[PDB]
Design a protein around this nucleic acid. Structure first.
Length: 150
RNA sequence: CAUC
């Protein structure tokens, strides 16, 4: 019986078919043809239209409509926290919403500090649920850090 | 939004 395959990639994309028994032969035929175009992403199958797919993430190229919202932008600010310069509380508070990359706190009876996350969405979620309330024992103004010029 |  014949089966289909789609090679959804950034630049090289396409589709083909083959005579097989089922996935037990189609899943060891398309593996060659896909690598001959050069795709080798998410190996998929549809059990109602009998059509494989391989949505690319292996030919080492991708871009879309993003720039000033990347892993570089993840720096954050926190202040009016309460008298604490030990980082541990705010560090687990930050990394709780999602993994950090760096944390800083000052030297003179502080209640003010700085932070950097790994995903800019970890910083965004943290900023959205750490602000204007309380964390250590104060009112926590929490913002993205303005401390850059590219 | 710096006390590094």
């Amino acid at each position: 019986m014949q089966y289909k395959l789609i090679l959804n990639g950034k630049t090289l994309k396409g589709e083909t078919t083959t005579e097989a028994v089922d996935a037990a032969t189609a899943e060891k035929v398309f593996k060659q043809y896909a690598n001959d175009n050069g795709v080798d992403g998410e190996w998929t199958y549809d059990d109602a239209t009998k059509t494989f797919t391989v949505t690319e993430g292996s030919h080492h190229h991708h871009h879309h409509m993003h720039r000033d919202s990347c892993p570089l932008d993840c720096k954050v600010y926190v202040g009016n926290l309460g008298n604490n310069g030990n980082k541990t509380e705010l560090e687990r508070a930050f990394g709780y919403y999602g993994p950090l990359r760096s944390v800083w706190v000052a030297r003179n009876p502080p209640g003010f500090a700085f932070v950097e996350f790994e995903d800019p969405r970890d910083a965004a979620d943290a900023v959205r649920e750490l602000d204007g309330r309380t964390l250590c024992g104060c009112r926590v103004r929490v913002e993205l850090s303005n401390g850059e010029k590219r």
